[PDB]
Amino acid sequence: LWREKINLLNARLAEAQTSEEQLQSQLDLQKKVVSDHMQRYLQV
Amino acid sequence: LWREKINLLNARLAEAQTSEEQLQSQLDLQKKVVSDHMQRYLQV
Numbered sequence A, B: 001l002w003r004e005k006i007n008l009l010n011a012r013l014a015e016a017q018t019s020e021e022q023l024q025s026q027l028d029l030q031k032k033v034v035s036d037h038m039q040r041y042l043q044v
Helices: A002-043 B002-043
Strands: none
Touching: A002 B002
């Protein structure tokens, strides 16, 4: 029963980690967009 | 013994939060460097 629980928790953990990675990529891209708007605010 | 455990884990939890906040402060310091270079670009 502990091994089946381990497998289920592994599945949940993998889902969480994939969400983490995708959110990380999105956060970095939004930082880049922030820099672009930042230079725009500079020019205007 | 569980009360002692609770006290030690309260002590440890504060330390982890402090390390988290220190890394957050480093992130904010990087953004502050960004803001200083910003303020340079405006002048020039």
